[PDB]
Design an enzyme around this catalytic site. Sequence first.
Site, PDB file in Angstrom:
ATOM      1  N   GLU A   1      -4.995  -3.459  -7.923  1.00  0.00           N
ATOM      2  CA  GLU A   1      -5.953  -3.047  -7.086  1.00  0.00           C
ATOM      3  C   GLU A   1      -7.467  -3.870  -7.573  1.00  0.00           C
ATOM      4  OE1 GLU A   1      -5.919   0.789  -7.510  1.00  0.00           O
ATOM      5  OE2 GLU A   1      -5.097   1.197  -5.484  1.00  0.00           O
TER       6      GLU A   1
ATOM      7  N   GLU B   1     -10.394   0.979  -2.068  1.00  0.00           N
ATOM      8  CA  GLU B   1      -9.617   0.386  -3.143  1.00  0.00           C
ATOM      9  C   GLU B   1     -10.773   0.081  -4.407  1.00  0.00           C
ATOM     10  OE1 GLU B   1      -6.676   0.670  -3.648  1.00  0.00           O
ATOM     11  OE2 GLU B   1      -5.673   0.100  -1.877  1.00  0.00           O
TER      12      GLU B   1
ATOM     13  N   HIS C   1      -4.182   3.501   4.337  1.00  0.00           N
ATOM     14  CA  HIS C   1      -3.889   1.710   4.212  1.00  0.00           C
ATOM     15  C   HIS C   1      -2.485   1.515   4.939  1.00  0.00           C
ATOM     16  CE1 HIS C   1      -6.947   1.702   0.845  1.00  0.00           C
ATOM     17  NE2 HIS C   1      -7.468   2.178   1.852  1.00  0.00           N
TER      18      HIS C   1
ATOM     19  N   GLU D   1      -3.826   5.406   0.396  1.00  0.00           N
ATOM     20  CA  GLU D   1      -2.997   4.424   0.545  1.00  0.00           C
ATOM     21  C   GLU D   1      -1.971   4.765   1.611  1.00  0.00           C
ATOM     22  OE1 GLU D   1      -4.339   2.672  -1.728  1.00  0.00           O
ATOM     23  OE2 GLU D   1      -3.679   3.083  -3.789  1.00  0.00           O
TER      24      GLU D   1
ATOM     25  N   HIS E   1     -10.262   3.518  -6.579  1.00  0.00           N
ATOM     26  CA  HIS E   1      -9.260   3.503  -7.420  1.00  0.00           C
ATOM     27  C   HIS E   1      -9.551   2.659  -8.587  1.00  0.00           C
ATOM     28  CE1 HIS E   1      -6.709   3.572  -3.347  1.00  0.00           C
ATOM     29  NE2 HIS E   1      -7.679   4.279  -3.381  1.00  0.00           N
TER      30      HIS E   1
ATOM     31  N   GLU F   1       0.793  -1.191   0.018  1.00  0.00           N
ATOM     32  CA  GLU F   1       0.015  -0.174  -0.024  1.00  0.00           C
ATOM     33  C   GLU F   1       0.913   1.308   0.018  1.00  0.00           C
ATOM     34  OE1 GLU F   1      -2.833  -0.158  -1.010  1.00  0.00           O
ATOM     35  OE2 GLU F   1      -4.039  -1.343   0.050  1.00  0.00           O
TER      36      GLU F   1
HETATM   37 FE    FE Z   1      -4.654   0.685  -0.565  1.00  0.00          FE
HETATM   38 FE    FE Z   2      -5.148   1.348  -3.440  1.00  0.00          FE
END
Ligand code: FE
Ligand code: FE
Lengths: 511, 511, 132, 132, 388, 55, 55, 55, 166
Positions: B195, B229, B133, B130, B232, B100
């Site tokens: 992802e 995600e 994350h 991220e 994304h 991440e």
């Molecule tokens: Fe992520």
């Molecule tokens: Fe991501």
Amino acid sequence: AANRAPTSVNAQEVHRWLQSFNWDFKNNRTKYATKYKMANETKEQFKLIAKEYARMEAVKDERQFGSLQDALTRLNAGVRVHPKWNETMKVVSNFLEVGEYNAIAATGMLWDSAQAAEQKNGYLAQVLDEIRHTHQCAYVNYYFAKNGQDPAGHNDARRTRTIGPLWKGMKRVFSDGFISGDAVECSLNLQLVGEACFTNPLIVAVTEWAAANGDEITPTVFLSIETDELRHMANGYQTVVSIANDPASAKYLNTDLNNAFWTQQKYFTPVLGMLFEYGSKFKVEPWVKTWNRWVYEDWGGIWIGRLGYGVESPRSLKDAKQDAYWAHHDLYLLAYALWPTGFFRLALPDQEEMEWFEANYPGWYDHYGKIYEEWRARGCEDPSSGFIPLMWFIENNHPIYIDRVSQVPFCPSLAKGASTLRVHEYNGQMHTFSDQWGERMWLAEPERYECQNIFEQYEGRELSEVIAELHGLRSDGKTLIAQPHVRGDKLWTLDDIKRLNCVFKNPVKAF
Amino acid sequence: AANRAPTSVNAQEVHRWLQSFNWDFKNNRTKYATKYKMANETKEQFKLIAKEYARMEAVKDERQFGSLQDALTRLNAGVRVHPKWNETMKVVSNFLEVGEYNAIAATGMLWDSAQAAEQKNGYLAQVLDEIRHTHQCAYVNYYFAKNGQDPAGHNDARRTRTIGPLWKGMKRVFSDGFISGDAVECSLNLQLVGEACFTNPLIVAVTEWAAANGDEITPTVFLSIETDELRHMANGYQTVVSIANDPASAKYLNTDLNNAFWTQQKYFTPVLGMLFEYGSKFKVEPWVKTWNRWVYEDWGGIWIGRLGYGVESPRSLKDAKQDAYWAHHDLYLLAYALWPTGFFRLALPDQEEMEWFEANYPGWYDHYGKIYEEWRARGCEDPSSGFIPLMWFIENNHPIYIDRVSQVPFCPSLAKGASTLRVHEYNGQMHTFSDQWGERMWLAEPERYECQNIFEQYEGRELSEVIAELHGLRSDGKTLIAQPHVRGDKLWTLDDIKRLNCVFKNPVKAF
Amino acid sequence: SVNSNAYDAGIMGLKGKDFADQFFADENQVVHESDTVVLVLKKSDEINTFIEEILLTDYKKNVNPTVNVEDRAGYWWIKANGKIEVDCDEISELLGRQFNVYDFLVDVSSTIGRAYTLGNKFTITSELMGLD
Amino acid sequence: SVNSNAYDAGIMGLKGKDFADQFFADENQVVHESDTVVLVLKKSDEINTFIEEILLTDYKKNVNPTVNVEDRAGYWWIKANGKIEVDCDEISELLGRQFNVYDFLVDVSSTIGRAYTLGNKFTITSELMGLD
Amino acid sequence: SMLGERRRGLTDPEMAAVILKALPEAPLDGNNKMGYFVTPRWKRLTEYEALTVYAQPNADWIAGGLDWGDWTQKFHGGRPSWGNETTELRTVDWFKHRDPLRRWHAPYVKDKAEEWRYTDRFLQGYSADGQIRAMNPTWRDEFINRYWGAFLFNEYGLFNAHSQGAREALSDVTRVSLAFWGFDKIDIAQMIQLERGFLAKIVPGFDESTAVPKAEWTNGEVYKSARLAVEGLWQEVFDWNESAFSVHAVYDALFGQFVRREFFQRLAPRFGDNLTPFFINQAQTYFQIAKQGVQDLYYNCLGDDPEFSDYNRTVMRNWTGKWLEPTIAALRDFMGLFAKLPAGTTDKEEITASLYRVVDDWIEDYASRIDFKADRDQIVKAVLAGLK
Amino acid sequence: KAEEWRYTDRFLQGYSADGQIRAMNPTWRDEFINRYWGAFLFNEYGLFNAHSQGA
Amino acid sequence: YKSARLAVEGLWQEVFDWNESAFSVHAVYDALFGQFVRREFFQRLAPRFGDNLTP
Amino acid sequence: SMLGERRRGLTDPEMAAVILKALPEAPLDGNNKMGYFVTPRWKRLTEYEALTVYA
Amino acid sequence: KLGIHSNDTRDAWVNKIAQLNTLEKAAEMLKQFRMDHTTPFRNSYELDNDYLWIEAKLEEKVAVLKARAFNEVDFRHKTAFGEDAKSVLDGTVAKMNAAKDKWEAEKIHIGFRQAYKPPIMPVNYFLDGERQLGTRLMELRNLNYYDTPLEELRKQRGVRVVHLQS
Ligand SMILES: [Fe+3]
Ligand SMILES: [Fe+3]
Ligand SMILES: [Fe+3]
Ligand SMILES: [Fe+3]
């Protein structure tokens, strides 16, 4: 740029000048009756301001919900709880709700009668607190109806309240005993007694019984409810210290203390004791021990004992400890007998429990145990039988009375707790009493206590009619919210209560 | 007073003019190399604004950290977890962390290579994602270190990971495979395959195995990780449409797609599968089934299958499916063999496991099973034995190699997956590869793949000194972090590793 | 439509050499186009409520009879044919509190298909947006 | 000291008639003064850390040897002779984040004794404030 | 490692097994809706409603009550816990009221917490930026410390006027509303003192002692009729509805609105002061939040009662008229401040326009709703008569 | 930032209902912020994009 | 906003040293130009037109 | 009511017992501090410094 | 019908309050009702189950008639019988501080409630009464509370002892 970074005004730099917010004018006095009129210029112990209070509580809620909403719902903590306890929480939550709701009003008097600015800010903050705890107890029922195994009674507790005699008392213990009377005295009845003694076993110690039976919903909510109740105590204490320093105000302390202590423990003791032991399967410990720890040894020890500061050990303690040993056993007999009234399902003590009772309450089987055995033999758990334990009370000449003061149901022919029948007649109306303290309260002040009991109102009424007028049914219109057993099979219908013909009688008509 | 009460102007009302925030000028162009020149008039599929972003994400953090800090610390959910999983989560969490974290920089390229204003906004939101994350994975290690059975590993998996062979692969799959290369290609490596294909078995699937082994911390954090995600995936897919709509850009697509797919699967498929089956007591399902679900049938058919756009199925697919069946079984042998290099405690398959593998991967026992049995017989767990499974590899002439490209350890003489040794020399340095695709990658781009391997760096070094320099020890400064058994007694020490005098040798030197 | 979109449709539910054969040869070495959609919803109060009282009730019967949800650990594995739409003002009404797509996006863990929000209406589809 | 401050200190821990015989007679029908204090800490991550790393290790060992901590289901039951004082700047330091008394009262579930704050220090004492 | 001494019915195998064995195969009622019987204000029942409505154990002899019987314990003398005799207003149902913002405790404290923390970050930014350098010293040393800091007691007195209401309120909803209203007021007072404390922090010589603005409140020429109104509304009214109504629908809507919006937030901008308007924004936001609830209670529920409409309206004109004069006196007295203003700060024309803004707003939002025949020109005129 | 976002929401909802817009100069409004303050928007926007490479 | 736009176009797109970008943006360009526009123009003159929105 | 079809090692008695029996007596290490080796700018480590440094 | 929220007693009194079209007939009926069914000193207990509801349904009539018949000053300062509330208040409090024991005090207070309960007297004066009156009654009652034996206390109350268990 110009200078450093201060927001250098914390809550405690603002609170330093909060006491000065009050100015001296003429009618700056309380709008309520009170015989306590010493100077009460006390400081708030937890120097809160409005925004910092809101932040603190916001953090509590922050963690509280989400645990409810994210993890506990993932673990299915609302279903993997356990039936008797699921039914028990309907009473515990809803009754705490109304107790803590009346605390708002009681605080209103404490706020209004306050003489310091810090405490008026503090007591409105406490008002907000008791509004919170209301919505919290409200949330427990909400969650248990939404996710639980029996939503009936959790969803309409606030109107299905109205069929049973246990409710009538709850509207007096931590409620009418708070708000309907002296205003400054609320420092004693609400705070020195109520929130300093009985909130602990009722809000803290219940969570143990909750967790023992799979409830992880109640601990998250109740253990956050009590977080507020400690600042309450300290501010009430400061009013107490003011009183006890004025010779003209200390004189009222002991009787009001005792009057408060009895008023609450009269209902608190038999009702919470019976909810713990008869509303659960896994016991944490005997209720007397809970009662002896929190109430007698610690509260009485660290509060009442310490004050002496001429403060007396309550006169009615002797009777209370006796109630702490038997009253909760006396009452389940009544509650289970009057099962078709409540908004919850009740169950008979099974074998392992009877042994548990007998082991910790020597004499339990010979008195209570045999009664439950007989009731089981008569088919109290079977709709096809046509039997309710109430019939057994009538057959065996065992009348059930309601105290005109406390509203607690009792049966003097069976009671091992410290209760003694007293019947009087005044102005064409008969009044029943279960102790000397209550009867003294009514003898002195009969205008405070005119509460019609379930027998006076349901006199000449057929049982099923009352249950149906007050919507004690479920979503089919057939099935009852209340049940004499806790299984989900062979539930009692309305036509099963109408099958038998129980019409109420006002027991005092026998005299 | 005034008129109505609009605070009106929510997210989608400011967003309507976001695309107009960019102005034309000369150098309004990417700073990163890219062979994709087409126009990204792409609309962020989620009309996000910085403040609504922060709001939504704050709500997730509210419930997530609530559950973690409140109810799950009360259920002791950091302790009531199977010891095998407690060890597995050191790798899973910390590896995902770096995955991440590299995705931040990868998104920093996508943000810089973007042309639309709404996507420059969206990609800084994705960068922030991220970052969350990153801190979330770190937090799982943080929690399990402070509230678990073995903090060792969790408390330093950022310097003790540097000793292992598996870490090297990790620094490529979801790391350098993203940030090192074409910027507008990250829509394919980071997003269209990263992802959109692998974060489901790597974040969503893991949660099942976590719950199976008593862990409710990982599902709480990880399920909240993956929630972002998807914005994304969509905001990456939009760039893919741009590329597929440009004939001069669609000419590079299938090559970049297949290369990214294989690059990732090469380490994702075995490492994660072996993490699941050999790191859990309770299995959810065979890894081949998880793999067949999310990868071949779902992501394959939903994205790649539907794009035919003009997109092709990966050429390496057949090799990839072969790795799904045996590569993870091939890797635990090596991983267990090189157990002192790790920062976590590994364990032999017990009887049920031994027959669960054979029940689901027939041919397992005759191959892997009897090796594990021999190893136990040799005393791989007993600190007194003087045995390490690397010795069996030497004695039986099974050289262990590391790919120059993927960094994945492989033993070709034993391998049942799709590994095929290929050795080359070029300017005085020899190179080992295990597959058609990887070695072609090096043959075309030898300046990218220069990563030294474990045997190269530690050449002629005694294992104890390697472990001791990289701090693979515990608080005592004696006992190894990693152990060949997941139990709690008779743990290996430095001396237990120094005693058997294992000196690293370059396998390639043997040619 | 509901067992067809089951997590364990063929070749799942096959184990041992029942699996390996159909897994290793030979039409299955190529990716197969799917008209389906995968929605992953985190197990919480709001999601369960929307699943129990909106998704499975009126949606599954009146709109998309092919939506199959299955219980996993801490999430719901949902799979339907074509698409799934979530009206979040509908949820807001059901909860008795303010709820948009972003309040709903708290517990939507993953997606396989194209996702997007049109105001307060979240939809996930198998249609390739922009090239179809 | 520490054990007279236990939850089940005698007469608790007597069963049946042995308990009744002491609970029902005779100098135990009047209230007995106690120089102790009760502190209910709600179970959490911050509070468990505090108890395990400041209360039991520093405060108990260096200031108040008599503090007893008992494990109940959802909370810590704590009792001590005299008082218990908590400087929250040490909890802030130990938690690796900002933390004041009002952050501390978030998990301070109950008190038996007269409690108050002064700056960021939380005090719960047996001393009667205002009469002594 | 260590699992602990105690056991749970949720984690512990033996207990869980007992509990799980006892569980049914389905819920025993298909109704997971708490307060399902509560008639919703809007389309479907809300959390606000579900967790609040019918929380007060009133009997049918109090409008909307569901219980029966008399109160279990009453005052010495016989006075009930809650009763119809605590107010002059009467209803078909006392539980009809809704906070249109649907505030119960949790969202309320959440919002205030946000405001509190952002205030902290703001003050840190404002101080670090050094914007104090762009503010006029006279406006600060005199007009902020003395005249803005004296309005503290106005908001404080107004907050305490809610005290009795917290005890006598005749339902759950109104109680929740009222408390929030008064709590907003005390917050505003403290936030005024917050600003004095902050100024005392970044400006040397500045004393944060309440002595100066207190003496302007207690022995002042400007706030003397204001304080008189406050003392009255606080401690001379025993009808909880008359209290709340007169404070929010009459006094604050005129005097409070004018002092905050048409003086301090209209004039501080002209002295280089972005400090106090920052808090006044909280103040006005609070006012317009409360206004919405005050409207639903007294106009939508009470004055639009399909049974006691004309009764309530008559009583509310009574209160409107009863309290309109101490307010006009409070306003006329406040006008003696425009003469301590530095020359050419504002003119008669602007002051007049601002007065009409407050008044026309008060007519549109309050007076008209109960059919009060107010004459804007005579009010503005009565107030301008003290314009020095 | 979420706290700021929601208080901003509450503020605007209050400002718009409190009618403070009336006291505001019409010239400074449709000219000095609509055109000259709304153009500093792009200054900060470019300043935003001057971080894309440092990420 | 001509020279300001030019400076922004430069800082944003003509610097490849990430340290140079961030430093020159926050320690030179914003600390002077941005601070003047935001504080010594708008949030100093806006109140003089009855505007509390922009501040 | 209905408790799904998936079981947990935290709830399910059969699995929980297995896990419980497999646990150690005490933590295998007393160093419960993630990022204990990380330099602290101030006297004590922070979550900021823990969750971030050396990622 | 014979229920709790719905019987024939209530219907009859609804259909009986729906004729009182004048304030004097309304105010006296209310005052009389309060003397008949309200206190422990009431004249009968036959409406014990329904008296609070019907008192309220008579209050509503008196209030709507009082407001429709009074001006603004009278409605604010005068009873429904035409008396100065400030005078009744001042006097009753004077009478209360002249009271010698708990017995004299309770009759005064209860009497004040039975007679001048809103919508008879304005709320403000009434609760100002409750304030001072309740103050004095409490002061006289809760002195030497437990010093009078229950046997002697039942005499003083004047109750008819029906049964005494021990
Ligand atoms: Fe992520
Ligand atoms: Fe991501
Ligand atoms: Fe409370
Ligand atoms: Fe309280």
